[PDB]
Amino acid sequence: PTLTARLYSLLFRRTSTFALTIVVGALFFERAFDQGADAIYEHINEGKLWKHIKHKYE
Amino acid sequence: WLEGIRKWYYNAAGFNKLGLMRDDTIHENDDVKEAIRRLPENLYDDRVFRIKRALDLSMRQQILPKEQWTKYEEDKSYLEPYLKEVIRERKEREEWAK
Amino acid sequence: IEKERDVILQELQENDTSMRDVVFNYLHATAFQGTPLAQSVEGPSENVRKLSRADLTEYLSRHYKAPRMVLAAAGGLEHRQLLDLAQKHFSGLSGTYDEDAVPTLSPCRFTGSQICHREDGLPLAHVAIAVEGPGWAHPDNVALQVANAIIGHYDCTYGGGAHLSSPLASIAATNKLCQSFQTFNICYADTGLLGAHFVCDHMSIDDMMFVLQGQWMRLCTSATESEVLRGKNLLRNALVSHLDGTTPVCEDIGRSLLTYGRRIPLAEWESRIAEVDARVVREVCSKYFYDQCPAVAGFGPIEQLPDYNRIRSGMFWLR
Amino acid sequence: RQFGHLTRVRHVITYSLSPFEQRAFPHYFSKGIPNVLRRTRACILRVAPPFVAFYLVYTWGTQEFEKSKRKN
Amino acid sequence: LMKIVNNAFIDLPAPSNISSWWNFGSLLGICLILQILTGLFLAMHYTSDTTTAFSSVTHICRDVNYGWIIRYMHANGASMFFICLYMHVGRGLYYGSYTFLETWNIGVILLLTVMATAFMGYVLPWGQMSFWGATVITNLLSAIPYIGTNLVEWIWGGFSVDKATLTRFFAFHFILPFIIMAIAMVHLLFLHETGSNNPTGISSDVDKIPFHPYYTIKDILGALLLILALMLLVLFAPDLLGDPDNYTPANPLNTPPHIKPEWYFLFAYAILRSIPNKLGGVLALAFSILILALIPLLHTSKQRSMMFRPLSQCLFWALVADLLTLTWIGGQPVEHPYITIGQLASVLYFLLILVLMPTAGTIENKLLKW
């Protein structure tokens, strides 16, 4: 069967298991989202932030 | 001519576009509920459906085809004969106190 | 043909008052939409008016064939006596048919839906909720007959009252939430209906659908061997008590030879019962109750009836 | 108040499906869009003109305000 | 057995057709609860004295860990808290909910109770437009005969806005929202005796629905979009609705060029600047608000909504333009083009409400043979 059906049978069926997914998702989401977001901002503002220039003054 | 103007206003209002009649729309009021209570079951049970259908339309923000819209000449005043009776009863109660 | 045409139209007007029969007919209409099972046995009054002799000769010449049929009996006779008459009489049946004369049955599309026939003029409210069933031959039918039997059934004439075992029946007799209810499992060729029927005052529905669904989800999560054992002993007696008389026995023969192909003796039913315990019930009910899309039906002052998303909301727990 | 005795209704039927058995976005673009334009033309001539009138008095008042401050 | 009261949030009968316009009633319940949490955390670092207040905001906006976001979720958390009203009210007037007199007259009492609270709240940063705002606007009560010279000095706690004027606003400000929260639960109480209205104005007892899965998630949506338009301003244009002269500390000996309240009062202010007679200007100001309490006594159409009242629709959306005008005139200075406009619009506001809109439904009845 599809993946969606496999996900439901294991995770979204039991509300106990369900909730643990959400916490687990948040952790890897919290990590992944912050890395990707910063990369965009830095890429836009490349060479304008402190760390991008900090090497010159150590 | 005024009749043509009454007709245009009716279509402009648009409660024909929801299949309603005029008396289906009147403000719920003490003199009115009395009149509604006196309706027969056939005419009443039709009023309820004309309303409950219309609400089901405005929820979906839709209307009916032109074939089902209420026609101006067909705008039945089913409630006024009973309502004008009630208001007459009210003025007697007031006049009797005076 | 024209006399009985008038009679059957008179019967429908009578069956318009048998509120119970209406609900199941409304129920099958919604569970089994777009399929034959949505139809009634009696069909619409239109076809009753628009029928012909030709339509019947087609129906009879098509379906009544010996292979699809069964003769069976019970009582003070002998098998061998029955054969000598079958060959004498039933040897003449059309035991054959054209290349594609006999149809076959495909599975039918269950669906999750609701039908709410509002009629406040009538004093009581019939309700019926159910789900998709296994079918006849599916073995977990046995376990479910227990599960229904745990819930049991009730009328306002039963003198047990509060002291009954089914906590649904106990509560209902206490608080007078209802006048009646029951638990059915209709079994079709490869599917069926599973649920319950109940009657109650228009100011008492919401309390029933909150306790009824609770007991289902109770079983899906936690049921004890004692009450399962209580249910098993009921299922034993029902099969035995149902088989008392030459008539219901040959019924059990006839349909079982059509549904299962053979008959099952009570020894084998007991053997299938014996393999039941609490673990079986938790699983099977979890397959067919827990977090499913049921069919719902109503007839009468059903204003208090929870909307289907609330019914469906209660088909699971947050536990 | 509560459900059950709010009013009286008779000979009315409702049919409904389970949301898990139907799409949440049926004909979302195919049918929804002209309904909007239909919902738009039905009312727009009653909403527009005072705001249309506003934009003019906004500019005309703005320009005349400017010209007042300039010189002879 | 509280949660029989939660049936007003779960098993409550509600109609089926109601569109987004009704969500603005709930959102105030979010803004209010949102704003209280923010303004509280501002109290932790605010000082009610004149020599320390303006800096205290700086302590927040500079040295505190994310103190700055809270200031702007809170200031602009008041602006959005009045976009919500003015649409929450316009519903009540356009769809004709004002027939629930008990609620409406309390709807007014919530409005005033608020729209003075922002006035007090705008002082607390203690800048120019804060001070001079309060200096001008309190003096209007001086126009009243035989009292005003006594009452204004009393409110000030002195003879001009000074320390004790500030410190008491901070206390009148950080309390009334807890009084507003009461009146809301009151305001709902008389609503849950009648149940809400629909676009049609028709009794919806037949097509009611619960509230737990349907409008809840609808309010979760509508609340989410609100948090967008708030945080956009906080994260993309925080000085937009502000006024930069506020970021100069108060100087009572240096009047700013443009004195004005913030955008959400200005239509009131334009009405005042329209009239030259001072006292007569005031009674117009208070009447521009209190006129809401005269609406139901001016209901004339035997219908309720305005989906089915064409002429009133055209007049209604004209009233909105008159408001938007008055919002604009008040923000702009006082000169011969804008004086003339500000006079006409203000006359329309009272004229249109009292005369035309009643007159319309009378006419509309006549066409329907009523």
Ligand code: HEM
């Ligand atoms: C309920 C209606 C309220 C309205 C209309 C309102 C409005 C305002 C406005 C517009 C400001 C100006 C802020 C600025 O310009 O930076 C302000 C300041 C302030 N508000 Fe609110 N507010 C309300 C409730 C509250 C509540 C409930 C609290 C605390 C729990 C609070 C605490 C403050 C404080 C301490 C200030 C001064 C600090 C500062 O402005 O930086 N306010 N209020």
Ligand code: HEM
């Ligand atoms: C702190 C301020 C307020 C709070 C907390 C509040 C809260 C609410 C809520 C949650 C509702 C139900 C949703 C709705 O019907 O739209 C409501 C209804 C209503 N509000 Fe308020 N509101 C406030 C301000 C106002 C104001 C200022 C007015 C009038 C000037 C008003 C007039 C009404 C009316 C007439 C209704 C009922 C209308 C109907 O149900 O058709 N409210 N209020």
Ligand SMILES: COc1ccc2c(O)c(C)c(-c3cncc(-c4ccc(OC(F)(F)F)cc4)c3)nc2c1
């Ligand atoms: C049918 O119209 C009505 C009728 C009666 C209503 C009523 O009696 C109340 C109390 C309210 C209400 C008032 N404040 C706040 C909320 C709220 C809703 C979702 C939240 O959840 C989150 F998503 F976080 F915003 C948080 C708060 C709801 N709304 C009514 C809307």
